[PDB]
Symmetry: D2
Subunit: 456 residues, 4 copies
């Protein structure tokens, strides 16, 4: 089916409600026109992020009651370890409270100052942690991933020619590692093909370069592989996931996405020495190698969640619900990044706000207008998030200037998607009304989280 | 709005799945062609009943962690007591584990053998408990309630002429009480108007006759009053509910319906003497006057749920979701009871299976076929449920021969409704294939729950 | 150990507090000097009963999150069914909301008016249900069970000579069944030996008489067999429990005791015909044969709890904690029923209040005084509970006139036991102050639950 | 009362068990004789730490069901924020996943390389983050805090003459801040007096020096003030806590101690500019200013638990339960740190193992032997934990060479304390059997967490 019914039913609910437009106007201004700064109770449908906002199952809530809260050697850590070893096939695991805790560890463990890290498109926390440890980030994603309107499969693939050029020009020894993300968040939640994963393994292995996956949305990625990559139509999601990670030396994971939890992450690796070093560092920032800044009950819920995520009907519906929202938006001519990704519809604010230049922050302003007009919260994924160039002080200027309608797993229905689409479509009819913004307060890094703006 | 989005979002889920038709064929025969005898894991979408199958809120689950499990005087009982006193306006409450526990008490308390009980249509457990205690049930519902296809408002209303006729012919002193149900389940979930409740109160009070409400779906009932009775458009659901019970001497309640819980009921009354007698009897069958066969945590969840149920947007959506299913079926030509009621769509098995006689049990067989062809469980509400005449031994033979597609509160989506409608519409295309049934095992009372059948 | 440390640790808590003496004085008066009528919030340590007041484990609370709330065929019911079949060895089980629900079913199913039911001492709800159905209760417990101060093992044993006498004088066909309770609650929590169950099975079998156990505290009973009956020292609690029920035709169970839950019970039987008849009747009073008036989650919690109860260290500590309280009392010369039973210490009010006659209700008044002086709630288990002779209207006058300090499973500590002991011992120093009571309001049955009194 | 009964009762339990000595011997060797490396399942009574191991209340578990899991502006964050503002009286709060996350933030925010941080005794993570950010740690605790056997009140107090000397010799501008911990963990859980907090506040404010409290066991600290400092006997615990922090510029807090939770922490400050900088940094390591690496439900549980901690009878019993264990050990002549502190009894391993030198790691070995002989886990708090001098590479070699029997809040009973005491006293009788240890694996920082040893 184009659009399957939910492969689950509702066990428990939380209410939603909408404050009137006059009040939303005030709230948007109080938040300095940054949706990050709005309060949860003032939001009707919260599409800021699919991170940590997921609905857990009855089985996970059973796990929540069985936390072994020991400071060291918790049974829940061992359940998590066994599960990740079985499903991902990595030798070793260090839990972290969430994904950027794992990025902090990886970056300190695997980067020498002066080295290059090459990735399939930047990510905000990921790039900050690479740069603060002395690395230069090099984008090796295929060109197509920066082309918003282009409807092509596997937009997240690395261009092997860009990888080869980095190697030839800078030398393999000067490359800390390749960061391969599945899916690619800022490209629109775009998947990477198994073919590309295998090809990257082969090239890097030949030159002795390590490859660490960002595994955060690896199950959405696995779904696209099953759906679209020839040869995989009859493989299980679990088989796909396991093969994906066989092409990697380790991974960072925010469990707050595809592990279907509200908190949690981990760092994996095959190398014994790196594992030892990781454990020496985890106690500095996170907690013991057997809790990593998580309560025992959360290691448990994460272990259970990862295994649930492998169910075909669950992930098919997950992805197709997002696709449904995108299809409704397209049917009305609303410009979006194509194809629709695993976790979100990305409005293309470059097209939506043609009357604004990127320097007046059209994505940031569009996200504010969406809230004011509909009570829906969405996220800036453009020039603000991209941050400043750490050598020149200028904005990084991504080609993609987008607003992310991000869907938490198992929280909303198609009726909620219809409400979102209807509201965005009405706003599009008067898109010329959206005004440019300027900074009135800009943090020194990861500025999108807490920046404040005013209208031009 | 015709069909509002859910005014809540999902906090936790439980998976659903479907076993193939060939296995369902076998399971249906193992169940003696009676949907009550099917196992839960063998059912894809379970519309057997809206009783006790509801999804609770996060707030209710918080109350589930706060059970004061004292054998007597639990703080949870006091919370329930004051909630019901506030919302229903009755003087006294006695908790029971569910509705038929309250029916057992009322019937033993209020019936002298040989007396009449008059109601707006029979109900199965209610009539059995009336008859077990020596009463003769008299149906005083308006004639239109028995006319499946007749689309009129407030089909649940008592015909005051029938009540008057009973008083005239039998004498007021020979009437134990009037049972006034809101809504009327077996009529299709049909509401009773405020005007009717008032007229019933006036006539009964003039003859000294007691009126006990069956409050089980009172909130659905209050919704229909708000929506359709002129003079009530601007009243809150809560003030409608309170006014309704101001015309009663007490009530039975299965909380497993409109109190949004999985177990729980109670008996209310204004009379001090009956309250005293009720407390003497509750300890025989249920438990103390302060737990009545419930865990403290369940009195808590029931108190919280009754109050949540008064939110307009919740109950508007609840009722319109049922209406949506009914609208799809009607549009495709599938025969249903009209108008659509508060809790369920009722297929008209008489019209659906015109090739069968009522003696061949078309509702029971239609329910079996629905399960075989779709994995949806539905309920017989026809000749089987109506039981036998306890004087003559003949089947009661109700005019309404129906299969009930019953919707748990806050559990399913419109997509689930679409799946259900598609399946029933497909079966309707070959309705001539539905075969008649005969009993192979018949229980001595309430026979629909566990009777077994074979095809004739 | 005489007194083992708890074989568990605390996963969660609820607070306790004590209102001052002058407030307790007022509350006791407002409660008509009946401890049943006190509110939970006004109680410091609530020892009214071990029924439904148990602390569940983390595993049970895990189970509480996994309720399959289906109206029929719940997976939780099948887990319960398979657990009871495995552990008790009965063919069939019918769930009930608690114990007296099962007694209602048994008594209606197995008693013809005019017949005798013989038991190892009466119990309150049990005897009422026997009588209501037209049986005469005959006490066949050994004489020693009525001798409060006698310290002998297996006081709950049936006297085979009394059973034989009944067979000889009334005929086997006039005995509905034998009701063998393990342990015997009103004898002081006294166990029955395996030797005795064997002998009763043999005598009843020879005469075609049925034996139904009251299984309510069968695990406490199994503990005494293991501790004290020759040949059982190396048998597991589970092995002992299974052998016990191999001597029975069925059982009633209140799960609210040894199944470690807050609500729940069941009826078991080996006979196919009785099982069919039980299922016809369960739907009248309780619910479906597959929920019996319980939420799915509670059948789950009860299935888990029954299996947990078989852990030797748990039930060892359970029983020895009670024994600890009894030993502290005996050390101070406070008169109690001997030996200490499985679930409670029974103060011997006959000796404690030797200045009052039984017609002045010493046990009722002692219970009132204990609350006033200490904030501890305890239960009348004497002339009040015994009720009225249904032929003569006089009080039944049990030899045992006792006040029960009943200990919920896994709730209190030895320090709590010490506080209770200190309070009772202090009261004992001035026991002469305890005043006689008289009825002010007397229910027609099970009078102890809600009766009100005043000082003579 | 010397030792009060628990001012709560048990709501739910988790089982404990003991593996036999021969298995414990093997597990201990497998853990390289480091108790941190043992598995929770292999531990009978786990006294490793009071961090994150607490039992929550029913009210907290209710709060666990009401997590608003929004990525930004969660209602649970606002509850935590207003709770801490009310109770601690700081202007601003930034949540962190636990204490060392708050220490990472404070140290990066408030230290310029080469500055001094002075504190009332070192702590492990605290000193590491100070040093890693370029500070030199200066111990300004009174000399008596380092004298295990010296029983004096308020041993945690800063020596004002050491602070004055630091200011005189280094200059106030070269002091990054003062770290004032309440209680002082490594001194034995020793309280700081209100008089000392005032004196430190006066001196630091005169030189424009900031004082940040380590708030981790501030409620235990408040208890000692109430119990022992003249002029506070009639004040509530909450009034005392609020006054304490009125002498501070901010705090770090691990909520995993006195906030009665299993995960959680925060950083407080009064200064607006520092709040802004902390928010710029929190997003790097932890998460948003409104979740800081915690699930919404954990911010809820922490807000609830901090408020519960202020209950006098709760904290009185908490501290007096520790005292009970300490009193038992002292009476048998087992050497301990005196007086007994808020959270633990510290065995004095220098005196316990007088036949060993500190170079042979007697605290580390004594902890290993306690586990082998008793199944009780305890913590090294001596030469291993103290780590190496970051200039010379020599062991810090603290005067206090101790093993900590650390008591989680609301988890164990006095009977568990008796079992622990019995086992320690028994081991003390053959204390000369305890063998010296040497490193076989030594981490580069915080080495006690994962170091492995072998017998000399
Ligand atoms: C592919 C990847 C992520 O998507 C990711 C997180 N994602 C978020 C949360 C967030 C992160 C960065 C932002 O600029 C942002 F505005 C929102 C999100 O909504 O997209 C992390 C970091 O994992 P943590 O969030 O568990 O630390 C690593 N890798
Ligand atoms: C208007 C009313 C009810 O609808 C009702 C129950 N209703 C059910 C459950 C059920 C009852 C009787 C059946 O023949 C049946 F097949 C199903 C239902 O599905 O409709 C009760 C009794 O409340 P209890 O179920 O809490 O005891 C009293 N009054
Ligand atoms: C050996 C047996 C029991 O002990 C028992 C109950 N016991 C209670 C509760 C109660 C019962 C009767 C009283 O007079 C009383 F004051 C208190 C108790 O505290 O002892 C039941 C009945 O099980 P239900 O309580 O689940 O219906 C059957 N059999
Ligand atoms: C006075 C203070 C603490 O006691 C403290 C922690 N205490 C622990 C856990 C632990 C910490 C350090 C160790 O060497 C250790 F072996 C155990 C403990 O058991 O004592 C923290 C840090 O708070 P976090 O643990 O929430 O990050 C800051 N300040
Ligand atoms: K249910
Ligand atoms: K209870
Ligand atoms: K923990
Ligand atoms: K979250």
């Amino acid at each position: 089916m184009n659009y399957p019914a939910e492969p689950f039913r509702i066990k428990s609910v939380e209410t939603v409600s909408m404050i009137p437009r006059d009040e939303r106007l005030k709230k948007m201004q109080e938040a300095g026109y940054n949706t990050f700064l709005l309060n949860s109770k003032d939001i009707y449908i919260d599409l800021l992020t699919d991170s940590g906002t997921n609905a857990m199952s009855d089985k996970q809530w059973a796990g929540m009651m069985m936390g072994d809260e020991a400071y060291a050697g918790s049974e829940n850590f061992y359940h998590l370890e066994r599960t990740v070893q079985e499903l991902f096939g990595f030798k070793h695991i260090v839990p972290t409270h969430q994904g950027r805790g794992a990025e902090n560890l990886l970056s300190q463990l695997a980067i020498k100052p002066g080295q290059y890290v090459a990735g399939n498109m930047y990510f905000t926390t990921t790039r900050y942690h690479q740069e603060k440890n002395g690395a230069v980030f090099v984008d090796i994603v295929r060109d197509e991933a920066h082309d918003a309107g282009l409807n092509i499969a596997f937009k997240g693939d690395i261009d092997l020619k860009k990888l080869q050029k980095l190697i030839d020009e800078k030398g393999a020894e000067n490359i800390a590692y390749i960061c391969l993300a599945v899916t690619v968040n800022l490209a629109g939640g775009q998947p990477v093909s198994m073919a590309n994963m295998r090809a990257v393994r082969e090239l890097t292995e030949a030159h002795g370069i390590k490859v660490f996956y960002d595994a955060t949305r690896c199950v959405e990625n696995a779904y696209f592989i099953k759906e679209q990559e020839q040869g995989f139509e009859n493989k299980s999601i679990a088989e796909i996931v396991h093969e994906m990670f066989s092409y990697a030396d380790g991974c960072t994971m925010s469990g707050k996405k595809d592990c279907l939890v509200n908190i949690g992450g981990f760092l994996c690796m095959n190398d014994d020495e790196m594992f030892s070093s990781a454990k020496e560092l985890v106690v500095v920032y996170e907690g013991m190698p057997s809790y990593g800044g998580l309560a025992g009950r959360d290691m448990e819920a994460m272990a259970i969640g990862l295994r649930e995520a492998m169910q075909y009907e669950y992930i098919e519906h997950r992805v197709k619900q997002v696709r449904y929202l995108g299809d409704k938006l397209k049917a009305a001519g609303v410009p979006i990044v194509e194809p629709v990704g695993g976790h979100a519809v990305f409005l293309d604010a470059r097209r939506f706000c043609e009357h604004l230049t990127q320097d007046e922050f059209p994505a940031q302003s569009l996200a504010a207008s969406i809230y004011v007009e509909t009570g829906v919260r969405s996220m800036e994924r453009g020039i603000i998030s991209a941050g400043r160039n750490n050598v020149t002080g200028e904005h990084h200027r991504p080609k993609l200037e987008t607003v992310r309608l991000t869907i938490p797993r198992r929280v909303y229905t198609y009726a909620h998607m219809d409400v979102v689409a209807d509201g965005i479509i009405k706003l599009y009819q008067h898109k010329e009304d959206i005004r440019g913004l300027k900074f009135i307060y800009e943090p020194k890094q990861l500025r999108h989280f807490t920046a404040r703006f005013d209208y031009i």
